[PDB]
């Protein structure tokens, strides 16, 4: 019995279909396309970590841009919103900075107020009571 | 390229011809026939393969000693070369010792 590959055409069309949008001979020559399709798939898998990394960098830039409109820095806003037990991530804060400018200014005011309470707290020796917004809600 | 553009003619198979409907008959000639005949005696084919099995080297050796005197000069010469090659390959080449 002599066996020959009768459907080798479909074995190469499952690879050449992913290369139809390439440039040059590497979109129609299987020998050239297979090495470029594999690299494209490798980049596709490794790009899921950069996509998450680049999103956060973009959010930080937009949060910083909106904070400077209120005379605040990024370390001052994120650091003092945490001490207010306000657990809003960068994605929401960037969205609030674009679509809710009056709500972001409210958080910028809250972070600025909490920032000033810490400075007053560090000046004293602990005898003075803590700030109004410095109070921490305890969960048991 | 390399694939036909038209379907091949349909393969009509007669599953109930004389040879298929009577395949396997008399395979129990010995057990059911007082062991006068042997099921390997039903086998037809080369006289050096009836009721026997072996690898390629054994088949060539067995064929040479049974029908070697009847083989053609060119065919016998090829058989001798094959035995020479197979002897060296099996007894000197391989992964296991």
């Amino acid at each position: 019995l002599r066996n020959r590959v009768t459907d080798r055409y479909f074995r190469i069309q499952e690879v050449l279909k992913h290369a139809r949008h390439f440039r040059g001979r590497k979109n129609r020559c299987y020998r050239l396309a297979v090495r470029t399709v594999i690299r494209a798939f490798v980049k596709c898998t490794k790009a899921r970590y950069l996509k998450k990394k680049n999103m956060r960098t973009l959010w930080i830039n937009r949060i910083t841009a909106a904070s400077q409109e209120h005379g605040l820095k990024y370390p001052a806003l994120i650091g003092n919103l945490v001490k207010c037990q306000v657990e809003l991530n960068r994605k929401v804060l960037a969205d609030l900075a674009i679509y809710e400018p009056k709500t972001f200014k409210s958080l910028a005011a809250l972070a600025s107020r909490r920032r000033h309470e810490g400075f007053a707290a560090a000046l004293g020796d602990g005898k003075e009571p803590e700030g109004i917004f410095s109070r921490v809600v305890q969960y048991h | 390229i390399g694939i036909r553009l038209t379907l091949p003619p349909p393969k009509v198979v007669d599953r109930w011809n004389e040879k298929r409907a009577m395949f396997g008959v008399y395979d129990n000639i010995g057990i059911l026939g007082n062991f006068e005949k042997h099921p390997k005696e039903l086998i037809r084919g080369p006289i050096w393969l009836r009721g026997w099995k072996g690898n390629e080297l054994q088949r060539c050796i067995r064929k040479r000693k049974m029908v070697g005197s009847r083989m053609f000069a060119d065919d016998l010469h090829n058989l001798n070369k094959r035995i020479r090659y197979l002897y060296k390959h099996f007894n000197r080449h391989g992964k296991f010792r």
Binding site: R4, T6, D7 | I3, R4, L7, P8, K11
Partner: peptide, 26 residues
């Protein structure tokens, strides 16, 4: 000519899909 029906049958269906794209029916 390579013996085999499954590959030839599968190629005809692919050709039919191309025929639809080139000349879509009403």
């Amino acid at each position: 000519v390579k013996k085999g029906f499954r590959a030839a049958f599968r190629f005809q269906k692919e050709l039919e899909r191309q025929r639809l794209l080139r000349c879509p029916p009403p």
